[PDB]
Amino acid sequence: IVGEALEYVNIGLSHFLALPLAQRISLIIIIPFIYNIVWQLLYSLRKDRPPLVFYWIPWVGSAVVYGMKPYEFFEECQKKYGDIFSFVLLGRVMTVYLGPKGHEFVFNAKLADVSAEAAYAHLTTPVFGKGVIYDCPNSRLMEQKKFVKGALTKEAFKSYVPLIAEEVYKYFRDSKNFRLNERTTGTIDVMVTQPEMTIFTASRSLLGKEMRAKLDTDFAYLYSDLDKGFTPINFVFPNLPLEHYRKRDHAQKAISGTYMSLIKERRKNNDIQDRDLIDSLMKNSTYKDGVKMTDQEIANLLIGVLMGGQHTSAATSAWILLHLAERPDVQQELYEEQMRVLDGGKKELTYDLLQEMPLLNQTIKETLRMHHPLHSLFRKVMKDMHVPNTSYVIPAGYHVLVSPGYTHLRDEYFPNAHQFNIHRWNNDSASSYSVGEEVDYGFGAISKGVSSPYLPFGGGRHRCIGEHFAYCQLGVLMSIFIRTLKWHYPEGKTVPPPDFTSMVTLPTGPAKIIWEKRNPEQKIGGRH
Ligand code: HEM
Ligand SMILES: C[C@@H](c1ncncc1F)[C@](O)(Cn1cncn1)c1ccc(F)cc1F
Numbered sequence: 449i450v451g452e453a454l455e456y457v458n459i460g461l462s463h464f465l466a467l468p469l470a471q472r473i474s475l476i477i478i479i480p481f482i483y484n485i486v487w488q489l490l491y492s493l494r495k496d497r498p499p500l501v502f503y504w505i506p507w508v509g510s511a512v513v514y515g516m517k518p519y520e521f522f523e524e525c526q527k528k529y530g531d532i533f534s535f536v537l538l539g540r541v542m543t544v545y546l547g548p549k550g551h552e553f554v555f556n557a558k559l560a561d562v563s564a565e566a567a568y569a570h571l572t573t574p575v576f577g578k579g580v581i582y583d584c585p586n587s588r589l590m591e592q593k594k595f596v597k598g599a600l601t602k603e604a605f606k607s608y609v610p611l612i613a614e615e616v617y618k619y620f621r622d623s624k625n626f627r628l629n630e631r632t633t634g635t636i637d638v639m640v641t642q643p644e645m646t647i648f649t650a651s652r653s654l655l656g657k658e659m660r661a662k663l664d665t666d667f668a669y670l671y672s673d674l675d676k677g678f679t680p681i682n683f684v685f686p687n688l689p690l691e692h693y694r695k696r697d698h699a700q701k702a703i704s705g706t707y708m709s710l711i712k713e714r715r716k717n718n719d720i721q722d723r724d725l726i727d728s729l730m731k732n733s734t735y736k737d738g739v740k741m742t743d744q745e746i747a748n749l750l751i752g753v754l755m756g757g758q759h760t761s762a763a764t765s766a767w768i769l770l771h772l773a774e775r776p777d778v779q780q781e782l783y784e785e786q787m788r789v790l791d792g793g794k795k796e797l798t799y800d801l802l803q804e805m806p807l808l809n810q811t812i813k814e815t816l817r818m819h820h821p822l823h824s825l826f827r828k829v830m831k832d833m834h835v836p837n838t839s840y841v842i843p844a845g846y847h848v849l850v851s852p853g854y855t856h857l858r859d860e861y862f863p864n865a866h867q868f869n870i871h872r873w874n875n876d877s878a879s880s881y882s883v884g885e886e887v888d889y890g891f892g893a894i895s896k897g898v899s900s901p902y903l904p905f906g907g908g909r910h911r912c913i914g915e916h917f918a919y920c921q922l923g924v925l926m927s928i929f930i931r932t933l934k935w936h937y938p939e940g941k942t943v944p945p946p947d948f949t950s951m952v953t954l955p956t957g958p959a960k961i962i963w964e965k966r967n968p969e970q971k972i973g974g975r976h
Pocket of ligand 2: 572
């Protein structure tokens with residue numbers, strides 16, 4: 449007789465529903481703790497799954513160590529399990545594939561196998577607005593990228609160089625952090641100066657003079673509010689009836705409103721030129737099926753493009769200054785190249801002359817090797833994926849994570865990888881090189897292979913289209929920094945470690961350097 453036992457299941461259920469509140473909340477905690485632990489041990493025997501990093505807390509997973517020190521986490525997991533392994537992160541399973549094979553597996557994955565917008569839309573759609581980037585099918589994104597890349601031409605860069613130069617000189621003249629007509633030395637926090645210089649230079653060139661003029665007013669604080677809404681917290685908590693979220697949504701509406709105002713003023717006056725990215729998208733933003741982007745979608749695409757470029761570029765010029773601050777030898781070598789290429793300063797800097805500055809471009813290239821601004825790129829797996837030359841299957845509903853910034857730091861691919869050495873790029877100063885066959889996904893021919901161990905701009909359909917703009921901006925900025933200033937660390941300070949929590953690998957601030965004028969008597973003209 450088992451019937452007697454099934455009575456005691458029923459009895460035990462009734463004795464359970466009647467335990468003291470102390471016993472039950474303790475049971476409410478301990479039942480999923482134990483179940484999680486036993487599920488992982490059962491998981492460890494599936495041979496069609498990559499090894500899964502062990503974690504104590506359910507749902508949270510390895511979120512803490514991953515969020516704080518992702519590269520240290522990857523190295524420890526790589527020593528234990530090899531190059532492919534999974535970990536739990538705030539409710540999701542992330543499968544990491546380290547190394548060049550990982551780059552191929554993720555960046556060159558079939559469109560049907562993985563979805564970037566399914567991973568990212570919750571981060572970005574609340575910040576940028578609807579209908580663009582990741583709030584739209586991949587085919588729409590592919591053509592959005594074509595539209596933006598159409599104002600990112602060599603001819604556009606030739607006109608952007610003197611405009612970016614003007615902004616840098618105006619920032620040296622007017623900003624409280626410098627005031628070079630009044631002060632010959634000073635101390636700056638590069639995490640204060642570089643965000644400002646980046647937004648001023650990117651606004652003037654990509655958005656135009658009107659939009660740049662608005663950053664001289666209270667309007668600039670909307671950018672700070674919108675910027676604060678770009679945060680990993682959006683991945684778990686993208687809308688909370690709280691104040692941070694309200695200034696974000698307000699800023700998005702107010703900034704996109706300002707761009708639509710300009711777009712509609714330009715069209716009401718037929719004042720549509722080739723000045724900036726606004727002119728360009730107004731003339732060129734009709735999809736191949738004949739649908740035109742709305743003025744709202746144009747404005748939102750501007751926000752996302754300007755904000756993406758904001759955080760990668762500002763982080764990078766911060767790291768460049770910070771590495772050069774302890775390398776007066778490198779500053780000296782870069783200064784000599786400035787003097788030779790620009791005839792002692794008697795040539796005005798042009799886009800063409802920037803391309804004849806290999807050591808300056810190698811300094812950018814080397815900073816992007818040691819400080820890849822995005823430590824992790826993500827996709828959501830949409831169809832079960834087999835990992836070649838293994839028995840592993842990554843099931844739909846998992847996410848795949850690739851980290852070229854981690855391979856940038858491996859000695860096997862970059863000897864003495866933790867040493868800043870711009871000369872490892874001698875006779876190889878190009879921002880990136882397609883090492884063979886090319887493919888076009890809708891925004892131009894790009895490298896078909898994505899196996900390069902140096903992959904600062906990703907690859908495949910989601911590859912960056914901002915690299916030449918970033919080199920132009922960083923190049924103008926650094927050419928002027930080098931010709932105008934020397935700089936060094938306060939006593940006993942050195943390169944700060946990265947803060948990875950922002951998802952952008954920023955220097956831990958305050959990161960202070962001391963500048964001094966190379967020509968204490970040099971004056972910057974213009975009105976102020
Ligand atoms: C140092 C500067 C930069 C670095 C290292 C960088 C890095 C990257 C990487 C790694 C990706 C691939 C993302 C993924 O696969 O999920 C990407 C995509 C992209 N980036 Fe950049 N970026 C930089 C600057 C810029 C700038 C200046 C702009 C705009 C002016 C920009 C706009 C974009 C866009 C539109 C994409 C396409 C995303 C997609 O197709 O899903 N980036 N970038
Ligand atoms: C999604 C986002 C990101 N941020 C942080 N970790 C991983 C990421 F994928 C990012 O790739 C960053 N970025 C890349 N180039 C410039 N910015 C991005 C892409 C396109 C865009 F229009 C705006 C934008 F923020």
